[PDB]
Design a protein around this ligand. Sequence first.
Ligand SMILES: [Mg+2]
Ligand SMILES: [Mg+2]
Lengths: 326, 326
Amino acid sequence: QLYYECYSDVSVHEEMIADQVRTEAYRLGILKNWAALRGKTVLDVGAGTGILSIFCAQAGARRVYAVEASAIWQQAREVVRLNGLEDRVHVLPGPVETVELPERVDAIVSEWMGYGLLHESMLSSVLHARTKWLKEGGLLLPASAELFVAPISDQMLEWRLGFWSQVKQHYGVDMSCMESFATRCLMGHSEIVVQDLSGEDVLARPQRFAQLELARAGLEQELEAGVGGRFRCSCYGSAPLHGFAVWFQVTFPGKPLVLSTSPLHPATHWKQALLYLNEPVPVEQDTDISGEITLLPSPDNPRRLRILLRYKVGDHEEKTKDFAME
Amino acid sequence: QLYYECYSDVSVHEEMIADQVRTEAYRLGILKNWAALRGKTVLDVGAGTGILSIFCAQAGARRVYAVEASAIWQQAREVVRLNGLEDRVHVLPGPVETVELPERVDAIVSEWMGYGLLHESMLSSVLHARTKWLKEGGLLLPASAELFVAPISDQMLEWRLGFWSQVKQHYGVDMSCMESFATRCLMGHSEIVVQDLSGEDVLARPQRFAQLELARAGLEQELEAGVGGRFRCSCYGSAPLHGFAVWFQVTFPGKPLVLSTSPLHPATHWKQALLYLNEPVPVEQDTDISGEITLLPSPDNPRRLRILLRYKVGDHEEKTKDFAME
Ligand SMILES: [Mg+2]
Ligand SMILES: [Mg+2]
């Protein structure tokens, strides 16, 4: 009959496990590496409720170290025991940067990805653990990530902006002047917005603007300096351009299994990271759009994602907008 | 190209106007009082974007004073002008408690209702304005409110709690121990939760536990002391009892038009106010439930809704739970 403060805690973990695209991609990606994991030792970075660590045991791992800093580590220990794996899977509380493992490991598994790939992500902790605890020639799951961008005409946003001009049709009162107000409020800000889109929102072929091989020399320094690159595309047809969507995929080594968060693919809890222009720009078929996207740490907090956008639409002058996570 | 901070502002007003049940009930409720409003003066308390004030003009009012304290009053003035009513409808910024009208009024219209009827509601301001500005024999729209309660088995909550015991069926990992954790987090707190339900969630005949005639002597004092009353009901069948839902209706004088927020009726943006027990209680057909519900000001803030619940399920001892708005 006591009162507890853990609603967010359960909601977050519920969302992740109920994300079948995510959870089944990890289950299968781990099983696909059975030959490399059989009789070997694994470190799970940010193990949460422990389900990926148990998948590793089920793929044949001799021993798994499940490291989790948040309050939820306690529930992981109970889940391990319930599945009869308390002698194979060891739950260790606290950050992986200072945990003491009794041995180096053959593999690191982690669901480290955040909104826009790098918002409040565990990637820096995975790389720290790779340097400190992974044996030479050891395995990282997933092994790589790719970043994508596309111009968008967000159909839900279009409806919200146009709503005010439609009030007269429904109630006999003209409220069309509310449209400029709504545009300022919904687009005239510099926050990254997390929202799920579909193919109906995508205005040109998506462009890959970066590829991250997670084991590669120098990646820690690239993350600090900024990850990204240039892009170019041509519009499919006539629409209000609202800005750009950014998303990612990750790949599990083997034919490789890919977990995608594209709006063209099955929805996931990551959705997409939307970068709105200050106001809509009309485009037509074959309107050329080019630009550059850079994912950066925020200066107050390297864990909060910043995105610097440069973009040029048709014959308009190149523009810049500097975003930070909502 | 400047940045503005008004997302919440537009979202709130969008939600209200897009609530067709709400907006059409006010449009029709106002029109239904055409004979009383024709050639008369009206005060709109908390006029927001101004749409109800314009409805009053369209119902024949000679003059309407639209009083609004928040930033949105500016958009109301533009809406009035756009509909060509700047000489009939006057928008006045600031709280109605200190506004200076050039005359007393024949009627007060207001959409004052909050979540659980009284959370951050404008009712005290409507009653203040009634005392200060309404002529003798003057009209209030709506004229009355009624409060309802029913026991509930929240099907969405039931699914969330049971989710953890279903993980084994889908991924081959037992997580059933997460259920007690989820119950503590989702039910073991004393916050009122705003959530929309349907008939599938309602476990016994809804009970009216209070009626408020808005013009009645003594209502201001009743609001301070607490509004509510006792109830009794008998369960329809076998289910986990999760607690109680509270909702309201308001009535426009004329056959009277009723705007309801019942889960048995068309959904509205008010949804219902849910009062969860600390954990589910099993009930059966004809299980008797009795109790008392009181809606109160919070001590820090009379505008934040508090609800004191007393309840007795079957042969169990009577219990008390003291809730405050989330
Ligand atoms: Mg996550
Ligand atoms: Mg309201």
